[PDB]
């Protein structure tokens, strides 16, 4: 359930290289159907070309998640496809981006709590190519449940979770109306911010918008947000008290006074403190089997010899929800590789930690797995 303000109310008065990961959804098995994933994250701007390679050639039917971004405004995407790995086949991921002088290739190395509802909005101008690209996604914790893409054929707000498909036509007609108003706002703000910064009408620019609310384990309101960004940099944001603003440069100060005089913060406060939490409670109840579950990490260990003297130990954690997890090696915050948590594509998450140990001293190292779905923290050793 999105914000429902009039269009004129919220009217307005840095390049990062993607990190890449290639992996499978489940442990790879001969003749067993699986999913090959390529998780790009931390990049800006949003334009990116991702291919999945099989034996030195492109895979035809490749799908990807809907564009979203993190707290630092950097984007992340998950490219995936169904595949059955055999003995000879080799897989990789090729990524092209404005920060890369040539496409980068990464091979597939085969060997009670708080809740939140988020909405992310991205608009990228396309001078001469047509109207700006508008993408909107909605999240309940780490689960996407709605989407909108201006280039899609439906021109509707589409379900992306089973528990939201229950809603009737009155719901989807309303969300479709509200998401189109969000697009019209960004469309106007793109032309406004262009002249506000004295930029040419031939370049591409990006507007990002985030808002939502947090609730505790008692489902009572904790915090709300409403942030705005231009070209990956902070523009204007609502403070934690939900009555004042935080503006960055001079042009954002002008919007701060136009929004203060029009009392925009009070309309946002009513949604974040009331409407946002009300429908978050409805989503948590309707999708209780999905959103209130706690999937425990399925753990195991791998041993790989590096130089016949130093040996690498890797602690794995798979198929766990939610994404919050801690992995530590005890003999050690040095010489320990910890990879970023990544989506598996089926709602679960993955992570591993590595430790380079001398050969013969394998049984002197322990890995600790802290997860909220685990009653007692696990300790793993070779």
């Amino acid at each position, epitope marked *: 359930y999105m914000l429902d303000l009039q269009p004129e109310t919220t009217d307005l008065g840095i390049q990062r290289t993607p990190k890449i990961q290639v992996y499978s959804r489940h442990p790879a098995e001969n003749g067993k159907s699986n999913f090959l994933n390529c998780y790009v994250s931390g990049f800006h701007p949003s334009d990116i070309e991702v291919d999945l390679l099989k034996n*030195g050639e*492109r895979i035809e039917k490749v799908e990807h998640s809907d564009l979203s971004f993190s707290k630092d405004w950097s984007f992340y995407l998950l490219y995936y496809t169904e595949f059955t790995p055999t003995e000879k086949d080799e897989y990789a991921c090729r990524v*092209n981006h404005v920060t*890369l002088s040539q496409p980068k290739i990464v091979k597939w190395d085969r060997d009670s709590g708080s809740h939140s509802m988020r909405y992310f909005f991205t608009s990228v101008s396309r001078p001469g190519r047509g109207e700006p690209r508008f993408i909107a996604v909605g999240y309940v914790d780490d689960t996407q449940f709605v989407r909108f893409d201006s280039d899609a054929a439906s021109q509707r707000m589409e379900p992306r979770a089973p528990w939201i498909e229950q809603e009737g036509p009155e719901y989807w007609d309303g969300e479709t109306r509200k998401v189109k108003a969000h697009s019209q706002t960004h469309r106007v703000d793109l032309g406004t911010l262009r002249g506000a910064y004295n930029q040419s009408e031939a370049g591409s620019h990006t507007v990002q918008r985030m808002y939502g609310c947090d609730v505790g384990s008692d489902w009572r309101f904790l915090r709300g947000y409403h942030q705005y960004a231009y070209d990956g940099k902070d523009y204007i944001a609502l403070k934690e008290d939900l009555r004042s603003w935080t503006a960055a440069d001079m042009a954002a100060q002008t919007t701060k006074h136009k929004w203060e005089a029009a009392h925009v913060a009070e309309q946002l406060r009513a949604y974040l403190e009331g409407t946002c939490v009300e429908w978050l409670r409805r989503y948590l109840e309707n999708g209780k089997e999905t959103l209130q579950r706690t999937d425990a990490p399925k753990t195991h260990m791998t041993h790989h010899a590096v130089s016949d003297h130093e040996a690498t130990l890797r602690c794995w954690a798979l198929s766990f929800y939610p994404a919050e997890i801690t992995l530590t090696w005890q003999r050690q915050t040095q010489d320990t590789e910890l990879v970023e948590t990544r989506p598996a594509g089926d709602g679960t998450f993955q992570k591993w930690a590595a430790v380079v140990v001398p050969s013969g001293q394998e049984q002197r190292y322990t890995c600790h797995v802290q997860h909220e779905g685990l009653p007692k923290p696990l300790t793993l050793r070779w």
Partner: nanobody
Amino acid sequence: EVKLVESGGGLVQPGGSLRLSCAASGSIFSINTMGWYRQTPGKQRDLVADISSGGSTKYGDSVKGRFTISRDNTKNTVYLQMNSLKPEDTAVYYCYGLSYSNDDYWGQGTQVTVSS
């Protein structure tokens, strides 16, 4: 390990054409997909066209309909027929190839200039 020999660049009038050629060295089993990228005014290079050893082709949006890639699979050599060339097509065109283990190889490139 693998070397790419490029030829067929140079100057051309608007509306004219040009045929680029790229030959890979080594065994025939050393290279699968072969194609071209072209240097943008900025940092990156953009996909023009590539083809697999089985004949599967892909074209960049900027060259669809005008450019055509073909392959002579008995000599691991690919050809790019660039028709209806415009000044916007002026760039250095890099040949590239992918090994069957997803190792990429890049040629030195050939300058292509379309007059005014």
